[model samples]
Target: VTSIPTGCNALSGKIMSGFDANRFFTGDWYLTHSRDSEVPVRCEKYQTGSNLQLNFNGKNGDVKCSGSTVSGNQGFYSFQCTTTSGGSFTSYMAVVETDYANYALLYRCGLYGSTTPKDNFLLFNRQSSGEIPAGLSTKLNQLELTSLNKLGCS
Candidate 1:
């Protein structure tokens, strides 16, 4: 059984700490599914440790963003988004799971409680066509991660 952390919300509790960013975020991830209607999201990440870069391609459009992992919390990070056309915002993010190479489960929220507090559940894979892994649904159900609508992605 997985142990849950204190002071953390549902999915956050399942996110283990001590992430190895070098192996984890060094490649492209195809967002397979999500609760945030923002799936079909593609992220190409570079570097590791406290500083990182991300080039995101999503349904809305593509943007070049940069971010760094929170010093003390490897599970948390923030991004500054911008596009060539000129637009930007700060968004916070967290991890639910990752194996440093193949797949990851992630969540994101607006900064400073700016937007309604909502958890964005995401499933990502190194390979664009990677199938949703088995047992994921059961885990989500076990954690009661069902309130958010399941936004399908390609």
Candidate 2:
């Protein structure tokens, strides 16, 4: 993970508009809440022992790649997805808010760090400690990240 795409776009606000993505990545999701600096290393007992499958076209197997479809003006899109799962390095996954089931508000950016994608926000949940929406608590306090920690793995 050295470096290369400083083609900067610093993930700003408003990218959530009807992002069903086949019912929000279909099945099992719960990280409680995060701004991911180290919410127990993105737990579900460390990223995938809890069987994380954010598959869209990754087809049954999970992490099969290619993304950019939530179809237009998604309040000014940012659907630039990419993956090969544990790849040589890639990021820019997006979903800035959701309601396909219970709650969601993911927003990853070319990994490592940022001034905007800096907090690398996340807050998925179908139920591990439900309820999250005062419009995702005012969009997580309008990006200053006013506390949502709970990826402590259990």
Candidate 3:
């Protein structure tokens, strides 16, 4: 049988959040499996008045902005980032590929060690020419992932 995409194996992504308040947010953004990266990019709450905006980078691609509240209290969000830049700086991105079970385990492990699980997975840094820049991802952020069926979440 063929192997999974190398990108999937080497996948590394992140999310960041900025707030005027000092307290941390304690909300969960569930993941929905999809064949498109765009959908994964969209599932973030930017904390902009309690919302997110479209983020663009040459590598991560272009992300469009949209929001909605579902059911009685569920909030729906999306970001469609692309991998292209037009200015002095071009673009690049990073990927983190770990199975969901491993991911959950890692999160719990951190919590077991007394680290709050509130800040497990979310946020990213900028990469240039395929290399991540130093001191990237300074801002608090959040991230959503997709194309992980190979990880066997069930």
Candidate 4:
């Protein structure tokens, strides 16, 4: 397993000793799987020993979006939404606590007319050893990835 430096030490080191060339940054690992190079399925893991909050907007030839919202409402229109871009990429939000972990796949509002199979999003604990839960699948077509991200905040 890759060992990360102490969080407190890493913070103080940035303030006292400054940058170090020998340390790997947290959130430096990434994974992706897509049908075509233009369209990809990606998931990233990060440390969130604390609360995480933010918003994002991603756009490209394979994906596009207007923006995002974090309203208190639990309705679908508020918690999940869809936009259009280039290919197709879905967005999700996750929370991993000391004793509990939860995730939600908001939406993938696109359709495919080509012969290619519509890609799906997934959630896995072991990255490779575990199976993707049935609820995480969303098969759509055309520029599906509207602004979605795999993020962690601590």
Per-candidate Cα lDDT values, in order, are 0.58, 0.50, 0.23, 0.25
Q: What is the model-wide C-alpha lDDT for candidate 4?
A: 0.25
Alpha-carbon shift of residue 107 in model 3 (angstroms): 12
Counting clashing residue pairs in each candidate, in order, gives 0, 0, 32, 12
At residue 152, what lDDT does model 3 achieve? 11
Q: Model 4 over residues 1-154: C-alpha lDDT tens digits?
A: 0111121111111111222211211122122222232333334332211122112233332222222322331111111223345344323222110111232222212323322133233232323222322333332122243333332222
- Tens-digit lDDT string for candidate 1 (1-154): 1221223344435665777766665767776556656434444332233256666754346666677565544477767777666767666667676775777777666543344245457676677665556535555676566553333334
Rank ordering of all candidates by TM-score, starting from the highest: 1, 2, 4, 3
Candidate 1 local Cα displacement, residue 76, angstroms: 0.6
Model 2 stretches with alpha carbons more than 4 Å out: 2-4, 11-27, 30-47, 50-60, 64-89, 92-104, 109-123, 127-132, 135-137, 140-154
> Which pairs clash in the backbone of model 1?
none
Which is the leading candidate under TM-score?
1
Candidate 4, superposed: residue stretches over 4 Å from native:
1-43, 53-69, 75-127, 134-154
TM-score of decoy 3: 0.20
RMSD of each: 6.1, 14.8, 17.3, 17.7
lDDT string, candidate 2, 1-154, tens digits: 1222354333444666566566665676665667655522544411211122343323222343334432322321222334455433335555677776777787655534432233266677767665455767776776677776665333
